[PDB]
Amino acid sequence: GRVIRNQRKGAGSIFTSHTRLRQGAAKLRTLDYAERHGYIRGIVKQIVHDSGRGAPLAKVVFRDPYKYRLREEIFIANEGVHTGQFIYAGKKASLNVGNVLPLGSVPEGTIVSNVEEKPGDRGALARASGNYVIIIGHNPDENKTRVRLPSGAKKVISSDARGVIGVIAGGGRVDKPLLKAGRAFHKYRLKRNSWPKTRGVAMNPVDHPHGGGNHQHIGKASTISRGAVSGQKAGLIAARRTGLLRG
RNA sequence: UCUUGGAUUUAUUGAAGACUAACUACUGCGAAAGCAUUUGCCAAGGACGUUUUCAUUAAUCAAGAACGAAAGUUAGGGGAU
RNA sequence: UCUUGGUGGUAGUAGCAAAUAUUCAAAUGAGAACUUUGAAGACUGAAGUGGGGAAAGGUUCCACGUCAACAGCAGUUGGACGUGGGUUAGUCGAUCCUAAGAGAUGGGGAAGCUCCGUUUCAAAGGCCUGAUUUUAUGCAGGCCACCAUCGAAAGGGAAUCCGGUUAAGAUUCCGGAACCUGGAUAUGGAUUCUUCACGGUAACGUAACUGAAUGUGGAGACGUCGGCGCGAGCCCUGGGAGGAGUUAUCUUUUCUUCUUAACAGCUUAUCACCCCGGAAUUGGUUUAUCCGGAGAUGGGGUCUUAUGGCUGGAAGAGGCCAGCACCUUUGCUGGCUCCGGUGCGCUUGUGACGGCCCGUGAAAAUCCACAGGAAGGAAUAGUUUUCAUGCCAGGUCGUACUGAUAACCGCAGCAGGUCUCCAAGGUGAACAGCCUCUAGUUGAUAGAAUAAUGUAGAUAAGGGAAGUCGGCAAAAUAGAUCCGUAACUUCGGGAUAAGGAUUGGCUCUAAGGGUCGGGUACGAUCAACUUAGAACUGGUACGGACAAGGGGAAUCUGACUGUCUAAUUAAAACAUAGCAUUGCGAUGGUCAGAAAGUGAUGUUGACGCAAUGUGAUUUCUGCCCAGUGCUCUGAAUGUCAAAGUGAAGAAAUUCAACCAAGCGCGGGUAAACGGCGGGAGUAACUAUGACUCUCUUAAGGUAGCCAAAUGCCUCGUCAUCUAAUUAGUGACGCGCAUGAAUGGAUUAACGAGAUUCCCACUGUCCCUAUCUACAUCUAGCGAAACCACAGCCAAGGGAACGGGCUUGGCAGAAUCAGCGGGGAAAGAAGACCCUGUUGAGCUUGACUCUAGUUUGACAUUGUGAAGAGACAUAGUUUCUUUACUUAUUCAAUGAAGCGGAGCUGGAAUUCAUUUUCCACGUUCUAGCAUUCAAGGUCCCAUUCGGGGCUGAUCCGGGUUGAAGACAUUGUCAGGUGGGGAGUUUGGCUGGGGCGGCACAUCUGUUAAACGAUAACGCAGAUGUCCUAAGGGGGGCUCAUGGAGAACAGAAAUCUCCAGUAGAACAAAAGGGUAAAAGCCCCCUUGAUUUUGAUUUUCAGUGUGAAUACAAACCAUGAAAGUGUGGCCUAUCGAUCCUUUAGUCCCUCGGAAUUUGAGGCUAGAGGUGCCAGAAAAGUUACCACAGGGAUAACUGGCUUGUGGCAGUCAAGCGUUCAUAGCGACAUUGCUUUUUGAUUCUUCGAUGUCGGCUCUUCCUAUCAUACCGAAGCAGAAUUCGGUAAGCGUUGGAUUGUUCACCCACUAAUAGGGAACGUGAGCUGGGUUUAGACCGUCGUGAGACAGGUUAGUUUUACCCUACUGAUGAAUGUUACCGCAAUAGUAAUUGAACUUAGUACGAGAGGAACAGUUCAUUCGGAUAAUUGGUUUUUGCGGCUGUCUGAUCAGG
Ligand SMILES: [Mg+2]
Ligand SMILES: [Mg+2]
Ligand SMILES: [Mg+2]
Ligand SMILES: [Mg+2]
Ligand SMILES: [Mg+2]
Ligand SMILES: [Mg+2]
Ligand SMILES: [Mg+2]
Ligand SMILES: [Mg+2]
Ligand SMILES: [Mg+2]
Ligand SMILES: [Mg+2]
Ligand SMILES: [Mg+2]
Ligand SMILES: [Mg+2]
Ligand SMILES: [Mg+2]
Ligand SMILES: [Mg+2]
Ligand SMILES: [Mg+2]
Ligand SMILES: [Mg+2]
Ligand SMILES: [Mg+2]
Ligand SMILES: [Mg+2]
Ligand SMILES: [Mg+2]
Ligand SMILES: [Mg+2]
Ligand SMILES: [Mg+2]
Ligand SMILES: [Mg+2]
Ligand SMILES: [Mg+2]
Ligand SMILES: [Mg+2]
Ligand SMILES: [Mg+2]
Ligand SMILES: [Mg+2]
Ligand SMILES: [Mg+2]
Ligand SMILES: [Mg+2]
Ligand SMILES: [Mg+2]
Ligand SMILES: [Mg+2]
Ligand SMILES: [Mg+2]
Ligand SMILES: [Mg+2]
Ligand SMILES: [Mg+2]
Ligand SMILES: [Mg+2]
Ligand SMILES: [Mg+2]
Ligand SMILES: [Mg+2]
Ligand SMILES: [Mg+2]
Ligand SMILES: [Mg+2]
Ligand SMILES: [Mg+2]
Ligand SMILES: [Mg+2]
Ligand SMILES: [Mg+2]
Ligand SMILES: [Mg+2]
Ligand SMILES: [Mg+2]
Ligand SMILES: [Mg+2]
Ligand SMILES: [Mg+2]
Ligand SMILES: [Mg+2]
Ligand SMILES: [Mg+2]
Ligand SMILES: [Mg+2]
Ligand SMILES: [Mg+2]
Ligand SMILES: [Mg+2]
Ligand SMILES: [Mg+2]
Ligand SMILES: [Mg+2]
Ligand SMILES: [Mg+2]
Ligand SMILES: [Mg+2]
Ligand SMILES: [Mg+2]
Ligand SMILES: [Mg+2]
Ligand SMILES: [Mg+2]
Ligand SMILES: [Mg+2]
Ligand SMILES: [Mg+2]
Ligand SMILES: [Mg+2]
Ligand SMILES: [Mg+2]
Ligand SMILES: [Mg+2]
Ligand SMILES: [Mg+2]
Ligand SMILES: [Mg+2]
Ligand SMILES: [Mg+2]
Ligand SMILES: [Mg+2]
Ligand SMILES: [Mg+2]
Ligand SMILES: [Mg+2]
Ligand SMILES: [Mg+2]
Ligand SMILES: [Mg+2]
Ligand SMILES: [Mg+2]
Ligand SMILES: [Mg+2]
Ligand SMILES: [Mg+2]
Ligand SMILES: [Mg+2]
Ligand SMILES: [Mg+2]
Ligand SMILES: [Mg+2]
Ligand SMILES: [Mg+2]
Ligand SMILES: [Mg+2]
Ligand SMILES: [Mg+2]
Ligand SMILES: [Mg+2]
Ligand SMILES: [Mg+2]
Ligand SMILES: [Mg+2]
Ligand SMILES: [Mg+2]
Ligand SMILES: [Mg+2]
Ligand SMILES: [Mg+2]
Ligand SMILES: [Mg+2]
Ligand SMILES: [Mg+2]
Ligand SMILES: [Mg+2]
Ligand SMILES: [Mg+2]
Ligand SMILES: [Mg+2]
Ligand SMILES: [Mg+2]
Ligand SMILES: [Mg+2]
Ligand SMILES: [Mg+2]
Ligand SMILES: [Mg+2]
Ligand SMILES: [Mg+2]
Ligand SMILES: [Mg+2]
Ligand SMILES: [Mg+2]
Ligand SMILES: [Mg+2]
Ligand SMILES: [Mg+2]
Ligand SMILES: [Mg+2]
Ligand SMILES: [Mg+2]
Ligand SMILES: [Mg+2]
Ligand SMILES: [Mg+2]
Ligand SMILES: [Mg+2]
Ligand SMILES: [Mg+2]
Ligand SMILES: [Mg+2]
Ligand SMILES: [Mg+2]
Ligand SMILES: [Mg+2]
Ligand SMILES: [Mg+2]
Ligand SMILES: [Mg+2]
Ligand SMILES: [Mg+2]
Ligand SMILES: [Mg+2]
Ligand SMILES: [Mg+2]
Ligand SMILES: [Mg+2]
Ligand SMILES: [Mg+2]
Ligand SMILES: [Mg+2]
Ligand SMILES: [Mg+2]
Ligand SMILES: [Mg+2]
Ligand SMILES: [Mg+2]
Ligand SMILES: [Mg+2]
Ligand SMILES: [Mg+2]
Ligand SMILES: [Mg+2]
Ligand SMILES: [Mg+2]
Ligand SMILES: [Mg+2]
Ligand SMILES: [Mg+2]
Ligand SMILES: [Mg+2]
Ligand SMILES: [Mg+2]
Ligand SMILES: [Mg+2]
Ligand SMILES: [Mg+2]
Ligand SMILES: [Mg+2]
Ligand SMILES: [Mg+2]
Ligand SMILES: [Mg+2]
Ligand SMILES: [Mg+2]
Ligand SMILES: [Mg+2]
Ligand SMILES: [Mg+2]
Ligand SMILES: [Mg+2]
Ligand SMILES: [Mg+2]
Ligand SMILES: [Mg+2]
Ligand SMILES: [Mg+2]
Ligand SMILES: [Mg+2]
Ligand SMILES: [Mg+2]
Ligand SMILES: [Mg+2]
Ligand SMILES: [Mg+2]
Ligand SMILES: [Mg+2]
Ligand SMILES: [Mg+2]
Ligand SMILES: [Mg+2]
Ligand SMILES: [Mg+2]
Ligand SMILES: [Mg+2]
Ligand SMILES: [Mg+2]
Ligand SMILES: [Mg+2]
Ligand SMILES: [Mg+2]
Ligand SMILES: [Mg+2]
Ligand SMILES: [Mg+2]
Ligand SMILES: [Mg+2]
Ligand SMILES: [Mg+2]
Ligand SMILES: [Mg+2]
Ligand SMILES: [Mg+2]
Ligand SMILES: [Mg+2]
Ligand SMILES: [Mg+2]
Ligand SMILES: [Mg+2]
Ligand SMILES: [Mg+2]
Ligand SMILES: [Mg+2]
Ligand SMILES: [Mg+2]
C-alpha cells in the first residue's frame, strides 16, 4: 500500500537529471531566411565532451545575418568533423559530412543525423552516439520524405525538415563491458538517479507488486495491460510476445 | 497454408540482400584451398624472346613458419533466398 | 497497578574502583589529602592532556569580595555566589557574486487559504550628450532585445605588515612602515612645427605615449593519482662570539642566543617564442621516449617573475650578555647579534610531465586587453590625471572566552557524540608502539588491611582437544635477508603457499659519488648512506622491550570489491558487471498534479529513456500456448449503455430495430505467470525392460545434479575417514517433494559466511595450583528495586506444592561476612493459545466502490462538395471520403524577409500571348565583415554640414510553419480499474483448527412404567413423492406352504386345501388395519369456500402440523354415513419489496374525466445458520480488551497404555509340571512411559538437553553373608537379608533415547516443580533477517530441511556455611559430655596350588604376605608448579653530558 519506485520518479525531486556539467542543449541553428533560401558558413571551433552524453559536441560559430556579432551553436559532432572545418547550413549547402541540409534537397540512401521531425524543431532524431537516419524515399508532390530510423521504423517526415550529413560520433561506446559497479556508478552519477536497481521480487508486498512471499517469485503474469494504472505497470508492459528471439 | 478485408495472376514504380546464368569447353589462371558482370588503381606471376647480366648462388628438406573448402566460435553489421 | 502531596522500612546500606601517582615543606586560614608557592616524583609524548579556530553556547573571559546552596569527600578554591571591568578594523569577516536551489511580477488555475511558473503568450528599459551660459544640463540626437529578488562567515572576491602594549583587546590600540578603492586636482616629465611616442630583423622593449558606439578575446575558472625537479619553513651539522649545566674522573664537552615582516627597486626560470643555420654516419634527450625539413642539434637572443639573491624597510626593532645603580623618577651605559655546510629527510607551496575514465572533473560578479575609428586636440599652449609626485575620504554589523574526560548536544561538571589547521628529537619502513624536549596537566572521595567470590593481567610438571554444540577463549606464528615454493587456474594468480636457515656487539675491508682540465704518459678537494664480505667476541645470545600471518586437505554456498536490519540477525540476504525480455519515433513511452497557458525523464531521441527478470567467467538453457495473463490491419447481425430512430398510445411511457469499446470467437506469445503422468505384456536370466499397447495429456521432467542448505522413511546402502562416527567426504538413485535466466551444472580468485579432517600449539580438559592490580574495616557522602502482614520446619487437609490453619517437631537478646535452596522472589494488566459480533498491516476471482484510462453521444462547431446520403419531375443536414479557414490546437522566433506580381538566357526549337518554366551576389584555406553605407542623383539657403531618393523592385500590413471543425475541453453513458478506499470473512465443539451437524426436524432407544429430561449418546430418517398413492362405494383376501396339470423343472400358468397376517399400506422406524386401512373395479375432486375455536411444540407468542365443529357448495353410496388431502407420528418460512387473485371497493387532499400510482383481503417469489445480516483470505511485523470460563510445560485425580509383581499349571526341560521355564486364563502394584481430564496458574511459577552439586528410594548391576540348581571343579543361573559403599573414559548426534570402541568389581533402575538458568551454557525448540523443497493465484503456510539471532537484579527475610556476642558476683584456668555428625572402599599379584574336584579338558577357595583403586584427613623434608624477594644476573629502546648509579 506504499507508492512504488517508478511512481516516485515523476515527482522529480531526486530523479531529476544532473545538469551542472553539461555544455548546453544541442540543437540545430534556427530555421531562418539564410538556411531557407541559401546557405550559411559556420566554423568548428571546439570539439568538447558533454557530461552524461556519449557523443562529443561541436561548437560552431556562425555570423549573425542581421547584427554584427557571432552566434555560437552547439551541434552534436558527426564522425570526421574536425576543428577549423567550415560547416555549411542551408538549402544550397553541399553533400559533405557535417553540413546541414533540408531532406528534400538530399538524394536517396543518404545518411543523416540530428534530424528534425518537423521543420524548425532544431534536431530530434538520431542523436545518440553512432546513430543515423537513412533517407529511403521522396514524395515531391505535397513534399514528404520517407526516412528509416535507428529502431528500424519507417517514418514520413517533411522535406523542409533539416538533417546533418554523417553519423553521430562516439559509436561503439556500448561495445565495452563496464566490468564493475563503479563504472556504472560514474556513468549514472552524471546522468540521473536510476541505479542501482533493487528487484521488485526482492521487496516486501508493500513496496512492489512482485514483492513478498516465502520465495522470490512473481506469482502473476509479468505482462501488464496498456490499460493498467500507475502502481500496476511493473513488469513487461503491453508485451506483444515474450521469451527469447527463437523460432 | 493463403484467400471476396480480392489470394493466385496482370501492369507500373520501388527497396533490400545475395548471386553472377546462358557464353562455359576433356579451356585458362593460381602453391594449394580456390578463382567467371564492367571499369579503374595497386603490387605480383608464368611462359616465350634475348649474341643482356651474375656465375654454383642449387635439389629435397627434421626444427620452424605462411596460406588453407565447408561447417563451427566470439563481437558488431546485415538479414532477400 | 486511583489522583496530588508528604513520609517510611530497606539503610548509614548498595555504592562513590576506567583514563599509571603522588609526596615533603612553608604560607594562608577557625579548620588544608584536595588552595597558593617552592621542592621532588610522574604523565600527555607534536594524529598531544600543546597552540588556534568552525558550529553551538553566551559573559562562562578578567579583577575584587566571598562560601548558605552547588562542585555525589572536602574546600580557605571554583566555569559557583556578590560587585564591577572588558570585545576599537578603509585592509580580518559579513556586506557583493553566483551554485544546487528558493521566489515575486505578467499570466493561467483554484470555492478559497493559495497553486503553477521564472522569461514565460506583457506596451516590462534607463544610459552616455561629442563637453558649458536662451540649460534646475536638456524640450535635440545616439546606443542596449537584456528582464525582480534571495541563496556560501569552507566556493569566487580590491587592499596591512612588523614591533610594542592590557587584569582581561588586538592583522582592530600605539609607534613605524605600506597598500587599495572612490573622489578632487595641480606640478614635473612625456607627446605635438611629420599633430596622437620611439627603438629592435624578430621574439619583444620602455616612465608616459588620444581612443566613443559596437564586437571579440583573456583572466575570474577549477579532477585525481604517480614519480621527478625547484623553493620555503623545520630537522641535522661545522666554525666563532656570549650565557648556563657537569666536572672524584673523563669530556676543545651538554644545553641555549646568534632574527629580519608586509611593501619597494634592481636582478633572477622551467616552459614558450624569435633570428641564423640546414641535419642519415640520424641527432638531441627525460627517472619515466618523446621531439626534429611543419626546420633538430648547435650559436645568439626574447619573455612570464612561481621562486630566490642584493638593497631599501632595518636595527633605531627583537634577542643574548656585561657593568653600575639597587623605596634610584625608575633604570642608565656598553658590547655581541657573524660566517658556513648537508640531504630518496619531514611538512607545505609549486613546476614540467605521465597515467586514468561509457567519470574528461561550477557559475557569476568583477577586472583587463584587442579590433574598430566616432570625436577632440599642435604656439607664451591643449591631451594623458593607464608616467611620477601632491590633496581628501573610507560607513554599518561581528570581534571577550570555551570549543570539550567541566563553557556544545546527550535531564548532569556524563568514559558517549561533535568539523578543521600547525606538528621537535631517538628507535624504527613508519604520522605504529616505546622513551624524551617545548607547552600543558598532575584532575578523577580518601586512609588502613590484603579473606572468600569477582574484574583485569599472568604463569604452569606430564599429557596435548581426551574439554565443548563447536578449539569458544588462549597459546602457537610474526619484522627483515637468503633459500625453497604443490594442486588448481579465468594464465592474471594461488603465494608471505607450504616449509627451512640467518640476525647482537666490536674491529675492519670492498664497492657504489660531486666538484674538479688540457698540446695554434694526471690528481688534489668535498660529502652521503646503502649493499656485500671478513675476523674477533659472548652462559649459542641477538626483529633480545616494543612491534608483529598459524598453516594445510576438502565440502556447501555467494563470482569478486561493495551495501544492510542505528539499539539482539553483516549473512548464503541486497547490489554488482554480464545476460535477456518489454514499451516508446514526441500532439510519444513511463511517471507526477485538485486544476492549469502545470510538471519529471528532458540542457533527453532507440549505442536513448522507461519497466522488469536473472545475476562474473565457462558450458548449457530441453518440452508444453490446455489454464491464466498479455497481445493481434485480426470475425463483424453473438452480447451491448446513453443519445438518436421507428411503432402504438391522449400522453406519461412501453415495445422494437440499430448499437462503440469491452467481453465472446479466432491467432500469436513461456529469458509471461506457470506446468512437465500411471499400469500391463515383453530378451534362449527369475525379477530388469531398447521395444509395444491402451488410460487420460497442453506436454508428460530433457541435459544435468542429488539422502544436496532440497529425501519423509532415514542414523537409507556401499566405500573411505576413526579404536569407536546420527558428523565429513566419494559413490548410488522409481528423486515424500531435484532440474534448467521462478536459471541447470561447473568454477580460478575472494569471504569477521556454514561444515569436516590433519599438523602446529596450548589450563579447553585430566586437575587443579600460584602471583599482581583494582569486596572487607574506617572518615565523609549516600540512593534504589521492592514491601498485605510477615518470615524455622515435617505431615495432613485445603483452589489437588503453606510463613500463617491442624497435629507434631520445637523454640533464647543483638549480630557480621558470604551464599544462591526457598520466598511458586523482582522486573511487564502473557508477545504463545482461546474469546470479543476489538483492530491494523498485507493479499486476492471476497462484497461494495473509486482516481486514472478507454469507447460512444451531445456541446464547443462554422463554410463546401461528392453524395452505393430518406420514403419512389421528390429535399442545405442523414449509417463513406476529402475541400476552406476564421474558431480551436501544436510549434518557433530579436515575431526579418511570407505570399503575389516584376530584367534577361533558353534543348519555350520566341509561332507574333510568360495557356507555359528554372535561376533570387556567398564552398581550396581556423583572416575580416559594425558607425541611418560608400557611390550616384536632388534639395537646403550653406554653417567646417544637414535632409530626400536610389543603392537595397513593387503590392497585401496574414510574424512564420503545422493542424483543422478533427483534436482539445465540458457533461453524461458503457467498459476497464487490489493502483487505491471502505467493510466482511456464522455457531456448536472434552482448547482451537480440520471433520461432523448433535443449528429447523421425524421414529425407536438412552429415559429411571404420568409428563419433561442431557452428551460430538446408540440405530436410522427429512428438504421428497402422488390426479391418485386424495375421497366415496362395492367385491375379494394376503405372505408362505402342501397336494395335483402337455411343454413346465426350484422358479411361467391353472385347481384345491391350509394359512390371525408371519403380506401389503410411496419413502425411516414405531404404532394401526382382515366381508380392511391390503388387493381389484366403478364414480369422482372435500387436495374446494368463509372465518373463528382447540391440541402439540410453547412465553401457553409465532411458524409448521393436527383435532373437532359451524355456515355454504359438492362428491360418493340404496342408505346410515364418510370426505376440509395422503391410515397416524416428519416432509418446511416473518417484516420490507415484487407479483397474482378478489370487490369494481377506498385514495390521489381546488373540481373532475381517463391512464398511472397507492391502499384493503388472500396466496406466491425466501431467507436450510430453517424467529429469517448482503460478505474471501492471511499475519512469524503485529495491536488492544480480557480469559486460568480455554490449549502449550509442573503439580493433582485416573492407569487404558507403559513398567514391575503374584496365583493356576496345559506343556518344555534326555524320564520329570514347578532346577530353570511356562501357554490358555486371572489378581494386583507403581507413577520413572504415553494417553485421559481441565482443578490450580494467562495484572507471566523462565519453556529442551548438558555441565555442576546434594540427598532420597529400592523393583540389587557390583561388593558382604547366605539358601537352591539340570551346583563335580571352574564359570554361570534362581532366590534371601541388604541401599553400607560404588556404578567410568570416549566416537557420532543439540538431543533425551540410541549405538559403538574401550576399561572396570560393576559400568542397576529411578525420584527430588519431567531436582537444579538472579548456578552456568544456549547446541536445540519458540519472535523479528535469509535460503530451499512441497503447498497456496497471492499475501503466506509447513510438530519439513537449513543458517544467524541482547540470557537482567540479591545489599532484604529465611535456609545454609563460617564469624562475634548481652545476660548467669567478676575474672581466669582445667575439664565433663547431652545432643548432632561420622568413613573408608574395591581389586590384583605371590603363596595356598596346577592342589581339592575332575576320565580328561580344565581348575578353586579360606588363612598369610606384598601392593594397588576410589574416597578422606592432614602435611611441605624432598620433587614439581607459582615469583612484586621486583633478591641476583642478563638484554632492547629512550632519558639523566660520559662513567658509575639509576628513571
Ligand atoms: Mg511510504
Ligand atoms: Mg508512500
Ligand atoms: Mg522503477
Ligand atoms: Mg533539471
Ligand atoms: Mg541508473
Ligand atoms: Mg541489472
Ligand atoms: Mg536488478
Ligand atoms: Mg525481504
Ligand atoms: Mg501490492
Ligand atoms: Mg512475490
Ligand atoms: Mg530469485
Ligand atoms: Mg495485467
Ligand atoms: Mg555472365
Ligand atoms: Mg540487422
Ligand atoms: Mg503523585
Ligand atoms: Mg520518604
Ligand atoms: Mg553516613
Ligand atoms: Mg562499581
Ligand atoms: Mg589522602
Ligand atoms: Mg618527592
Ligand atoms: Mg611516558
Ligand atoms: Mg573566600
Ligand atoms: Mg561535596
Ligand atoms: Mg579546593
Ligand atoms: Mg571563584
Ligand atoms: Mg576582507
Ligand atoms: Mg543573486
Ligand atoms: Mg486565471
Ligand atoms: Mg529570504
Ligand atoms: Mg564569501
Ligand atoms: Mg570553485
Ligand atoms: Mg570565501
Ligand atoms: Mg567581493
Ligand atoms: Mg607610510
Ligand atoms: Mg618616449
Ligand atoms: Mg587577460
Ligand atoms: Mg586518481
Ligand atoms: Mg593507482
Ligand atoms: Mg603592507
Ligand atoms: Mg600583503
Ligand atoms: Mg583595441
Ligand atoms: Mg567603521
Ligand atoms: Mg559595529
Ligand atoms: Mg578581537
Ligand atoms: Mg558556554
Ligand atoms: Mg541520558
Ligand atoms: Mg563524556
Ligand atoms: Mg555534560
Ligand atoms: Mg617536557
Ligand atoms: Mg577515583
Ligand atoms: Mg601444562
Ligand atoms: Mg603434540
Ligand atoms: Mg567438529
Ligand atoms: Mg562461544
Ligand atoms: Mg626477503
Ligand atoms: Mg613463507
Ligand atoms: Mg592453498
Ligand atoms: Mg638455507
Ligand atoms: Mg653485528
Ligand atoms: Mg550449506
Ligand atoms: Mg559476497
Ligand atoms: Mg533501529
Ligand atoms: Mg555482510
Ligand atoms: Mg531477500
Ligand atoms: Mg526539467
Ligand atoms: Mg498456455
Ligand atoms: Mg493463442
Ligand atoms: Mg528474462
Ligand atoms: Mg515445476
Ligand atoms: Mg536424492
Ligand atoms: Mg548424509
Ligand atoms: Mg542434508
Ligand atoms: Mg557405491
Ligand atoms: Mg552423490
Ligand atoms: Mg525453460
Ligand atoms: Mg567458470
Ligand atoms: Mg563473511
Ligand atoms: Mg604443546
Ligand atoms: Mg583444566
Ligand atoms: Mg587456585
Ligand atoms: Mg565496608
Ligand atoms: Mg565507614
Ligand atoms: Mg542522606
Ligand atoms: Mg548514590
Ligand atoms: Mg528504595
Ligand atoms: Mg497478618
Ligand atoms: Mg497435603
Ligand atoms: Mg512446610
Ligand atoms: Mg507465601
Ligand atoms: Mg486447616
Ligand atoms: Mg483454626
Ligand atoms: Mg498442635
Ligand atoms: Mg510426636
Ligand atoms: Mg519439624
Ligand atoms: Mg556482631
Ligand atoms: Mg559489614
Ligand atoms: Mg549472590
Ligand atoms: Mg533464591
Ligand atoms: Mg490491561
Ligand atoms: Mg491479560
Ligand atoms: Mg462470534
Ligand atoms: Mg459471540
Ligand atoms: Mg499494522
Ligand atoms: Mg456539436
Ligand atoms: Mg471559428
Ligand atoms: Mg517571422
Ligand atoms: Mg471535435
Ligand atoms: Mg469532461
Ligand atoms: Mg482495484
Ligand atoms: Mg482493499
Ligand atoms: Mg476440540
Ligand atoms: Mg448441545
Ligand atoms: Mg419416571
Ligand atoms: Mg448412551
Ligand atoms: Mg447427542
Ligand atoms: Mg431436514
Ligand atoms: Mg412414493
Ligand atoms: Mg407457540
Ligand atoms: Mg409471550
Ligand atoms: Mg415441524
Ligand atoms: Mg395434508
Ligand atoms: Mg384429512
Ligand atoms: Mg398416499
Ligand atoms: Mg424490515
Ligand atoms: Mg379522500
Ligand atoms: Mg375528483
Ligand atoms: Mg388506473
Ligand atoms: Mg398500481
Ligand atoms: Mg383465505
Ligand atoms: Mg412466501
Ligand atoms: Mg434460529
Ligand atoms: Mg496485550
Ligand atoms: Mg480451569
Ligand atoms: Mg487411566
Ligand atoms: Mg500407570
Ligand atoms: Mg497399570
Ligand atoms: Mg501379588
Ligand atoms: Mg524332575
Ligand atoms: Mg494475573
Ligand atoms: Mg522462580
Ligand atoms: Mg542379590
Ligand atoms: Mg570386598
Ligand atoms: Mg553410597
Ligand atoms: Mg562424542
Ligand atoms: Mg524425556
Ligand atoms: Mg574387569
Ligand atoms: Mg516424584
Ligand atoms: Mg515431580
Ligand atoms: Mg525441570
Ligand atoms: Mg531446571
Ligand atoms: Mg527451577
Ligand atoms: Mg545463564
Ligand atoms: Mg534449563
Ligand atoms: Mg540457538
Ligand atoms: Mg522485520
Ligand atoms: Mg519451492
Ligand atoms: Mg539456528
Ligand atoms: Mg550473527
Ligand atoms: Mg538467566
Ligand atoms: Mg539475601
Ligand atoms: Mg569412591
Ligand atoms: Mg598429616
Ligand atoms: Mg602450581
From Swiss-Prot:
Its main location: cytoplasm. Gene3D superfamilies: 2.30.30.30, Nucleic acid-binding proteins (2.40.50.140), Ribosomal protein L2, domain 3 (4.10.950.10). GO terms for molecular function: RNA binding; rRNA binding; structural constituent of ribosome. Pfam families: Ribosomal_L2, Ribosomal_L2_C. The keyword Secreted does not apply. Component of the large ribosomal subunit (LSU). Mature yeast ribosomes consist of a small (40S) and a large (60S) subunit. The 40S small subunit contains 1 molecule of ribosomal RNA (18S rRNA) and 33 different proteins (encoded by 57 genes). The large 60S subunit contains 3 rRNA molecules (25S, 5.8S and 5S rRNA) and 46 different proteins (encoded by 81 genes). Belongs to the universal ribosomal protein uL2 family. Component of the ribosome, a large ribonucleoprotein complex responsible for the synthesis of proteins in the cell. The small ribosomal subunit (SSU) binds messenger RNAs (mRNAs) and translates the encoded message by selecting cognate aminoacyl-transfer RNA (tRNA) molecules. The large subunit (LSU) contains the ribosomal catalytic site termed the peptidyl transferase center (PTC), which catalyzes the formation of peptide bonds, thereby polymerizing the amino acids delivered by tRNAs into a polypeptide chain. There are 2 genes for uL2 in yeast. This is Large ribosomal subunit protein uL2A. It comes from Saccharomyces cerevisiae (strain ATCC 204508 / S288c) (Baker's yeast).
